């Protein structure tokens, strides 16, 4: 219900869109460093998956 009427104001003089954005951005600032970690280890593990697939193909070609 605050999504539809989020452009109204509080008693102090703050918009509901403003405080919702502030809470969401505070959550994003809390969670952003650990996301950039888990994506860097995610792409790292993808890179070792590639290197494991290619060591498998080269050993398959060397042993026949």
């Amino acid at each position: 219900p605050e999504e539809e009427q989020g452009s109204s104001r509080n008693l102090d003089g703050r918009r509901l869109r403003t405080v919702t954005e502030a809470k969401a951005l505070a959550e994003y600032l809390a969670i952003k460093p650990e996301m950039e970690k888990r994506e860097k280890e995610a792409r790292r593990k993808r890179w070792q998956e590639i290197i494991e697939m290619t060591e498998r193909k080269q050993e398959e070609i060397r042993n026949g």
Partner: peptide, 27 residues
Amino acid sequence: EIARNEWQRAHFDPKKQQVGGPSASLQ
């Protein structure tokens, strides 16, 4: 080309024309 355009107009088909993710925190 004039003859071909006239042929295209003559055989124009009336039967082929009909009228009438991510989260909110990141954005």
